[PDB]
Amino acid sequence: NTPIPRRHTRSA
Amino acid sequence: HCLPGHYTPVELKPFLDRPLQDPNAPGASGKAFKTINLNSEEQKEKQAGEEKHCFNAFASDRISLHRDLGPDTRPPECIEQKFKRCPPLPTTSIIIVFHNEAWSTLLRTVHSVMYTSPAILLKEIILVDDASVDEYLHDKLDEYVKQFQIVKVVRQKERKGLITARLLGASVATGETLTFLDAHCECFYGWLEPLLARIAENPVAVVSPDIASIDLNTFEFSKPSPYGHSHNRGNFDWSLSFGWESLPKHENKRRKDETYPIRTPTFAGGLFSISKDYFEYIGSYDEEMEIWGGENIEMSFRVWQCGGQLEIMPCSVVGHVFRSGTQVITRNQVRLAEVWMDEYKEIFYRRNTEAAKIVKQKTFGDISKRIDLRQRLQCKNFTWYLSNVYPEAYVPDLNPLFSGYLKNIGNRMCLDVGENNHGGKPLIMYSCHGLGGNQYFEYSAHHEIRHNIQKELCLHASKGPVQLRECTYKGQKTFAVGEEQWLHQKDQTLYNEALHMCLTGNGEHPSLASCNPSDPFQKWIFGQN
Ligand SMILES: O=c1ccn([C@@H]2O[C@H](COP(=O)(O)OP(=O)(O)O)[C@@H](O)[C@H]2O)c(=O)[nH]1
Numbered sequence: 011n012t013p014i015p016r017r018h019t020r021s022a
Numbered sequence: 023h024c025l026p027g028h029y030t031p032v033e034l035k036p037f038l039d040r041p042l043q044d045p046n047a048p049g050a051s052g053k054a055f056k057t058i059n060l061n062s063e064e065q066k067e068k069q070a071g072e073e074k075h076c077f078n079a080f081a082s083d084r085i086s087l088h089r090d091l092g093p094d095t096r097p098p099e100c101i102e103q104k105f106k107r108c109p110p111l112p113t114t115s116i117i118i119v120f121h122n123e124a125w126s127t128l129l130r131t132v133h134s135v136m137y138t139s140p141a142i143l144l145k146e147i148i149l150v151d152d153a154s155v156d157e158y159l160h161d162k163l164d165e166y167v168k169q170f171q172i173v174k175v176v177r178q179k180e181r182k183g184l185i186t187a188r189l190l191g192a193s194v195a196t197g198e199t200l201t202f203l204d205a206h207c208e209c210f211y212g213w214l215e216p217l218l219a220r221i222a223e224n225p226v227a228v229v230s231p232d233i234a235s236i237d238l239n240t241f242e243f244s245k246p247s248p249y250g251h252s253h254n255r256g257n258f259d260w261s262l263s264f265g266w267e268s269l270p271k272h273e274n275k276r277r278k279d280e281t282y283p284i285r286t287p288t289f290a291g292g293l294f295s296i297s298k299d300y301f302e303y304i305g306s307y308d309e310e311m312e313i314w315g316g317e318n319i320e321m322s323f324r325v326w327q328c329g330g331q332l333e334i335m336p337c338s339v340v341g342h343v344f345r346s347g348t349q350v351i352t353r354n355q356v357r358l359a360e361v362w363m364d365e366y367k368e369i370f371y372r373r374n375t376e377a378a379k380i381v382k383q384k385t386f387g388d389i390s391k392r393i394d395l396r397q398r399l400q401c402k403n404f405t406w407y408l409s410n411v412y413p414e415a416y417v418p419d420l421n422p423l424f425s426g427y428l429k430n431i432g433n434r435m436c437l438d439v440g441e442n443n444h445g446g447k448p449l450i451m452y453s454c455h456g457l458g459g460n461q462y463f464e465y466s467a468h469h470e471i472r473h474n475i476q477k478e479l480c481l482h483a484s485k486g487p488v489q490l491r492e493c494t495y496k497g498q499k500t501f502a503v504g505e506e507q508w509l510h511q512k513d514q515t516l517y518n519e520a521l522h523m524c525l526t527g528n529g530e531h532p533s534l535a536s537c538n539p540s541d542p543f544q545k546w547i548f549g550q551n
């Protein structure tokens with residue numbers, strides 16, 4: 011129901 | 023055209039001199055702007071901005087487009103670095119793609135570039151409008167930008183996304199190099215020379231700055247530390263998500279000081295520089311990819327496999343406002359897996375059911391042009407990539423014993439690792455989506471129940487909530503410990519041999535309970551997608 015995590019790049 | 027010695031500070035003076043800044047102004051020197059106890063209109067503006075841009079535009083709009091970032095806090099070898107005039111520093115075309123960007127954030131980006139980039143390097147700033155609606159991004163932008171002489175707006179008439187926008191930008195650029203940035207960035211002092219110097223020395227290097235965080239609520243800039251706080255490399259997981267990981271020991275040893283490139287298996291891909299000639303030679307971007315998502319992993323694999331170097335230059339620091347349909351991204355990922363990943367594409371397909379489907383239905387488009395590119399450049403294979411570029415990677419089995427989902431008969435929901443489970447956290451029960459991802463589990467020959475997308479994690483029996491832990495079995499000497507061994511019994515129970523108990527899907531968190539095969543909450547289907 012959530013997608014396979016992404017959409018915005020993550021930071022460190 | 024090749025002079026002796028090193029460029030002088032005056033030779034590298036910036037394209038525009040930054041006006042003196044107010045040290046007590048909002049967000050001066052990169053400090054936090056706390057926007058708290060606002061009047062009634064003010065709270066509606068902030069809320070509107072948040073919903074349009076997914077950052078505190080209220081804050082951005084009250085911060086100078088000209089803000090400095092205070093003292094230069096980079097390691098001393100970065101601050102003192104000198105650059106040879108032979109080979110010369112190449113010119114660059116800055117390419118910024120935008121879609122409905124806030125004015126404050128787009129023009130702070132462009133001003134930052136002009137105040138920090140040497141005049142002798144900054145050939146042009148190309149702003150590619152990916153069909154913005156906001157009217158202030160049309161004639162007002164066009165007129166505002168004329169004064170800078172080197173800034174050009176290119177209009178993509180219909181929204182086709184970042185990939186098409188970047189290729190349009192590259193097609194009109196006249197710089198020797200291309201430098202891609204997003205429309206919500208701030209350049210640190212000295213950011214450009216290290217990228218362009220590295221391309222000058224090594225024309226097949228594709229080079230990224232160290233990307234600093236600009237806080238989406240306060241616009242605080244995370245400044246570099248003068249020790250170089252242990253760095254990160256880019257990686258991928260077997261869902262083909264971009265991620266960050268610590269440098270290995272061998273790379274810490276090779277890098278004598280911070281001016282040395284960091285070799286990176288993957289790049290974030292928002293911010294980087296490349297020779298314009300090499301960008302063309304190495305096959306630019308796959309034109310059949312739509313909107314965005316995956317192009318940074320595709321380009322990572324292509325650069326490495328086809329004989330280039332993917333590098334982070336820690337002396338180069340650029341800040342970025344980090345924030346936070348699926349069909350377009352999955353299709354892009356299938357196209358990169360089919361071209362580059364050889365037999366390892368099946369590891370990805372087993373974890374992303376939508377990707378397996380796109381492959382079976384052959385909806386990912388023709389890849390013959392990317393296969394021809396790979397052949398013409400005589401690229402190495404994905405085994406070579408994993409052995410030579412990413413020898414630290416966890417690589418799952420090509421042909422695992424069994425994989426699928428674990429559905430509970432009692433609540434009809436699926437066992438689910440939840441968000442950001444890298445181990446040490448309980449699991450949850452979640453609606454069965456059939457997509458893989460956080461509901462993906464494998465069964466191993468050692469009776470482990472693995473969730474292995476990024477780390478090799480094992481369902482680990484305890485008195486409390488069951489947890490995921492890093493699997494103890496990982497090679498010939500080692501063993502799978504009792505807590506990580508499970509039997510799926512004829513009565514559909516998941517039995518832990520060590521604790522003599524069965525997994526129950528009742529409660530907030532799945533837990534071990536006295537075995538009761540009549541209890542539907544203890545009955546599991548290990549289903550295949
Ligand atoms: O339809 C779109 C969506 C995004 N972008 C641009 O692509 C870049 C990446 O998007 P975003 O910053 O949201 O991604 P992230 O940086 O969070 O990965 C930005 O310069 C966006 O303006 C675009 O050109 N077209």
Ligand SMILES: *[C@@H]1O[C@H](CO)[C@@H](O)[C@H](O)[C@H]1NC(C)=O
Nearest residue numbers: 364365402403404405406407
């Ligand atoms: C991949 O290349 C390596 C050497 O780099 C070679 O050992 C291996 O057989 C190749 N794999 C395939 C599937 O051809």
Ligand SMILES: *[C@H]1O[C@H](CO)[C@H](O)[C@H](O)[C@H]1NC(C)=O
Nearest residue numbers: 012013014440441457459460
């Ligand atoms: C998205 O996250 C939710 C929890 O917020 C679940 O973990 C769900 O399984 C996820 N979806 C996918 C496809 O992994």
Ligand SMILES: [Mn+2]
Nearest residue numbers: 204206292343
């Ligand atoms: Mn961005």
